[PDB]
Paper text:
The L-tryptophan biosynthesis regulator, TRAP, present in several Bacilli, is a good model system for investigating determinants of the oligomeric state. The tryptophan RNA-binding attenuation protein, TRAP, possesses similar geometric features to other circular assemblies, being assembled of multiple subunits and containing a central tunnel. When activated by increased levels of L-tryptophan – bound to receptor sites nestled between adjacent subunits – TRAP binds single stranded RNA at the leader region of the trpEDCFBA operon transcript. This modulates terminator hairpin formation and so downregulates L-tryptophan biosynthesis.
A short segment of C-terminal residues defines whether TRAP forms an 11-mer or 12-mer assembly. Based on the previous structural work, we chose the S72N mutation because we expected that the bulky side chain at this position would result in the exclusion of N72 and following C-terminal residues from the subunit interface. Finally, we show how the 11-subunit to 12-subunit switch could be induced by the point mutation S72N. From the structure of the S72N TRAP we see that substituting serine 72 for a bulkier amino acid, asparagine, does indeed introduce the necessary constraints to exclude the subsequent segment from the subunit interface. Exclusion of the C-terminus from the subunit interface can be achieved by introducing steric strain at a key region towards the C-terminus that causes the segment to pivot out. In this respect, exclusion of the C-terminus in S72N is achieved in a manner more similar to how exclusion is achieved in B. halodurans TRAP. To understand if the 12-mer state of the S72N TRAP observed in the X-ray structure, predominates in solution, we analyzed this protein by native mass spectrometry. The 12-mer state was identified as the dominant species in the mass spectra, as opposed to the wild type protein which forms 11-mers.
Residue numbers in the entry:
A (entry chain B), B (entry chain A), C (entry chain F), D (entry chain E), E (entry chain D), F (entry chain C), ...: 7 to 70
Write the structure that this text describes.
């Protein structure tokens, strides 16, 4: 139930969930536009999140 | 039992629950108007929340 | 056992419980008048609360 | 486990327990007079508390 | 094991336990005099405590 | 494992344990004299403690 | 595993364990002299401790 | 796993473990000399510790 | 549920998951470019993370 | 998993583990020299630690 | 799920996992170069981590 | 779960794990040189750690 908050500062920001398991592949890519926010949990299927494109990011450890 | 608070600063703000599971898709979109607030938990079915349109957002980590 | 506090600043404020489950719909709408307060927990049946009309709201994360 | 404290600033303050379950109705209404206090827990049967009439209210999140 | 402390500032203060269950009624009323204190837990049978007459009250949330 | 500390400022102070159960009665009354202290837990049998006569009392919530 | 610390400021200080159960009686009285300290836990058999004679006392809640 | 630290400020300090159970008696007495320290846990068999002779004592609650 | 945040200050930064088990090898290498971020959990399969190339790193213990 | 840290300020410092059980005896004595440190846990077999000779000691409660 | 962060200040830094068990031997040695970081957990197989060569190290207790 | 950090200030520092159980003996001695660090957990087999030779040591309780 750990999560991350991501706000796209500029258009065309991209958020990628990476599969948990022995295998590691991108299983979903959610596209974000200027101002749009996403709050994503880590889950049974997502053990890593990748962020392409200039965004603003909050995590338990702080702001990016 | 982790949640997010979202208040629409202007009209026509949109809040999107994304399915938990192997698959990731929008299963519900709740529409908000100027001033209206929504407090949403993450749940057995919602592992990520998306926010289209200019809103004010609180999360465990702070304000957006 | 997480909850929210909602006080109506003006008449005709509306508080909506949204069903927890695969489905998401309004199952109850409680109407509030100037000054009246409601303290509502999230529950086996309510995984999100919506607030129509100008209210004052406290949550774990702070005041709205 | 969670509770709320309510003190009636003026006469004829009213405190309403709302049933927990699929259904949501008032199951009890306890009447309070100037100065009288009530400390009420959320319970197996009460998942939301409503307060009609001008009162002073403490919750985990603070004073109202 | 959550409790409340109640000290009667003036004579004839009254402390009322209200039944936990589907039903809500007064099952015990303990009377207090000037200076006398009572420390009462919420219990399997008491889910709300009511205080008639001018008292000083401590709870988890603070003084009232 | 919750407890209360009670010190008699003057002679003839009285400390009363009240039965936990559907029933509520005094099951023990321990008498205190000037200076004497008692540290009492809440227990399987004591769900409320009453204090007659001018004492000094500490609880989790502070000094009385 | 809750405990209390008691130091006798003057001679002939007395520390009394009171039985936990439906019954409440003194089951042990340990005698303390000027300077002698005792650190006593609450236990399966002791649910209240009484202190006769001028002592200095620490508890979870503070100093006496 | 709660413990106490005892350092003898002078010679001939004495540390006494008292039996846990219905019965309460000294089962061990460990003797300390100027400077010598002992760190003692409460245990399945020791529910109270007594300190004869001028020592320096730390407990969860602080210094003596 | 422990995680690390890694942001590439310059192009061609590399993030390597190392297998948990008796054996220790690289099982995945995710490539990062200027600005791109990755939030990675430790998992059933990743017990150590290696970071090649000039990055900015947050962990529970702080910034690197 | 509670422990103590002991550093010998001068030569010939001695650290003694005392048996946990109904019986209480020295089962091990580890000898320390000027500068040498030992970090010792309390364990299934050691419920008290004794320190002969001038040492520096850290515990959960602080420095000695 | 306790871990250590290690960043090589200079080239040719070496990070060594030591086997948990009755036996203690080096089972893996991961080599680090100027700037490269490694975040390593203690695990079912690694109960001690050794760091040869000039590095910067974060642990639960702080920086070294 | 608990660990200690040890950095050798000078050459030829020695770190000794002592067996957990009724018996207490050295089962491993790991040698450290100027600058080399070791982070060691307490484990099913190590209930005490000894440090010969002039080192710098961090523990939960602080620096040595
Ligand atoms: N499938 C991998 C994905 C992953 C998680 N954390 C990582 C850190 C680095 C590289 C890959 C990963 C896993 O579940 O473990
Ligand atoms: N169905 C996905 C949805 C998701 C959660 N967190 C994410 C982060 C990134 C991308 C997708 C997701 C899941 O339950 O895991
Ligand atoms: N029925 C949905 C309701 C919901 C909860 N949180 C949300 C966030 C966004 C959209 C819908 C929701 C659920 O239980 O998950
Ligand atoms: N019967 C509903 C009552 C309720 C609790 N929280 C709410 C929030 C909004 C509206 C109704 C409710 C339930 O148990 O869930
Ligand atoms: N019998 C009710 C009493 C009660 C508790 N909290 C309340 C709040 C409001 C009204 C009634 C109550 C119950 O156990 O739930
Ligand atoms: N027998 C009652 C005693 C009690 C506890 N708390 C109270 C508060 C008010 C009045 C009575 C009580 C019970 O166990 O619940
Ligand atoms: N035998 C009583 C003793 C007791 C504990 N706490 C008290 C408070 C007041 C009076 C008596 C008591 C019991 O176990 O409960
Ligand atoms: N045998 C008693 C010893 C004891 C513990 N705490 C006390 C306080 C007072 C008097 C005696 C005791 C017991 O286990 O309970
Ligand atoms: N396979 C190893 C990987 C590892 C984790 N932590 C380490 C520290 C140092 C060296 C290797 C490791 C393990 O699960 O334990
Ligand atoms: N064998 C005793 C040792 C002991 C622990 N704590 C003590 C305090 C005082 C005297 C002896 C002890 C026991 O396990 O309990
Ligand atoms: N195999 C040993 C390794 C070890 C852990 N901590 C230590 C401290 C000192 C010496 C050796 C060790 C063990 O699991 O316990
Ligand atoms: N074999 C002993 C080692 C030990 C741990 N802590 C100690 C303190 C003092 C002396 C010996 C020890 C044990 O497991 O308990």
């Amino acid at each position: 139930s750990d999560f991350v908050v991501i706000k796209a500062v500029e258009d065309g920001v991209n958020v990628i969930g990476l599969t948990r398991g022995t295998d590691t592949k991108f299983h979903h890519s959610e596209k974000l536009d200027k101002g749009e926010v996403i709050i994503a949990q880590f889950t049974e299927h997502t053990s890593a999140i990748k962020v392409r494109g200039e965004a603003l990011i909050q995590t338990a450890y702080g702001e990016m």
